Every structure is written in structure tokens, then in C-alpha cells.
């Protein structure tokens, strides 16, 4: 088993990076309990928690699309490999990628799902409320047959 592009030119000078996974406009995965809440409603004071922040939150990472954008803006080349919905927000995220000159040939476009929207069934167990995912979002549901092997080659 092998894959051939039929091209022999040396690609291009800043070598490509492929960023695999999910795209969100901005989204912090790393969350933990912090000691100091500011006021629960006044967002005008949460600056105090971006200048004296939790230590896990001192330099948050985010979606790999953030890394793709930053890498391209730092002068490299990035391809984002992932899936988005056919809805307006998936278009907005692909447009964000394209305007940032992130290469989106591996970005698939599910037509029957709603980008960020995950279906979950709320359940009660041990008297606690719980959720279970009934349908995964597009960005969670890229198949191994939807990989762009030209990107993974480059």
C-alpha cells in the first residue's frame, strides 16, 4: 500500500505543517479549579485574572487551528486537517482559516451536521445530573477515509 502524488518538484521553501483535529473560534480546553473568583457577573474585573492568572492558565493553549494560524503568521505554512459543518459557522471557520492563509485541503465539509453543535442526552444517575453524547460534532467525527494524503505527504 502506497500513495503517489505524481509530482516531483520540491514542494515549497517553508515546509508544511499539518494541524489535525478541531477548529473553534476560540476555546480553552485546559480548565481546572481556581482559588480566586472575581465577581460572578461583572466581566469588567476578569482582567485581574488575566494578569494574575491561575498557573495552569498562565499560557493557555487552544484548538490546533490557533496553532495553524499562528504558525502561518510567524511565516511558516500550515494545513489544517479536520471537519466542519455545511452550516454558516463552518463556512465562517473555513473563511477564518483561508483569510489567515491556512491551507484547507484536508478540511472536509459534513453536510448533515451543525459544526460546533454536539447532541447530548441529559441523564440523572446517583441523583446527579449527567450528560452522554448522542451525536458527536463534525470536528469530532472526521473519518480515516477523509484524510488528505497529499497534505500528510507534504
Amino acid at each position: 500500500v502506497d500513495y503517489d502524488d505524481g509530482i516531483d518538484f520540491p514542494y515549497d521553501d517553508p515546509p508544511l505543517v499539518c494541524c489535525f483535529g478541531a477548529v473553534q473560534k476560540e476555546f480553552v480546553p485546559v480548565v481546572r479549579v481556581h482559588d480566586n473568583p472575581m465577581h460572578p457577573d461583572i466581566y469588567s474585573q476578569w482582567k485581574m485574572l488575566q494578569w494574575d492568572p491561575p498557573e495552569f492558565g498562565r499560557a493557555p493553549g487552544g484548538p490546533p487551528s490557533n496553532v495553524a494560524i499562528s504558525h502561518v503568521r510567524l511565516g511558516g505554512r500550515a494545513a489544517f486537517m479536520g471537519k466542519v459543518g455545511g452550516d454558516d459557522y463552518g463556512e465562517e471557520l473555513v473563511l477564518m482559516m483561508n483569510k489567515e492563509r491556512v491551507q484547507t485541503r484536508g478540511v472536509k465539509f459534513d453536510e448533515g451536521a451543525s459544526t460546533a453543535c454536539t447532541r447530548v442526552k441529559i441523564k440523572f444517575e446517583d441523583g446527579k445530573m449527567k450528560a452522554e453524547t448522542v451525536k458527536e460534532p463534525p470536528e469530532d467525527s472526521l473519518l480515516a477515509s477523509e484524510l488528505n494524503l497529499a497534505v500528510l505527504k507534504e
Binding site: 469588567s44 474585573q45 482582567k47 485581574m48
Partner: protein, 75 residues
Amino acid sequence: TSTIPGFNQIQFEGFYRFIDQGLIEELSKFPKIEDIDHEIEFQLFVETYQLVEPLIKERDAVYESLTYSSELYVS
């Protein structure tokens, strides 16, 4: 702390302090008043101090050339 204060807040917090304590503070210094024959006596019961709202609104007071003012009553 986190943000540029409201510029009028220095006035606002001053005036509210005047309402929140300066009325009690100054009315508390009102003495008992005694007549010349030492038989009749008058005092304000400062605990009953009551500012009723201005019966005339600002945009009417400015038009009629009046003072926009609350009325202090005491028993």
C-alpha cells in the same frame, strides 16, 4: 480597581456619604431647647429623619427656575 472610575463618581460617592451619614451626624448635634422659665422643652427626634423625594422633576425645576430638592422631615 479593574477599570477607569466613573469621572463623576467622586461627586456621587461624596453626595451619597452626605445622605448616608451627614444627615444623622448633623441632626444628632441638634440640642434640646429650653425656655427662659425652665418649664418647656423642645427636641428633634433625629431617628425619624425622612427625605421625601422632590415633588418637581429636574427638567421642570430648570424650566421654572427652581431648586431641585428633597424635603427633610423630622418628628
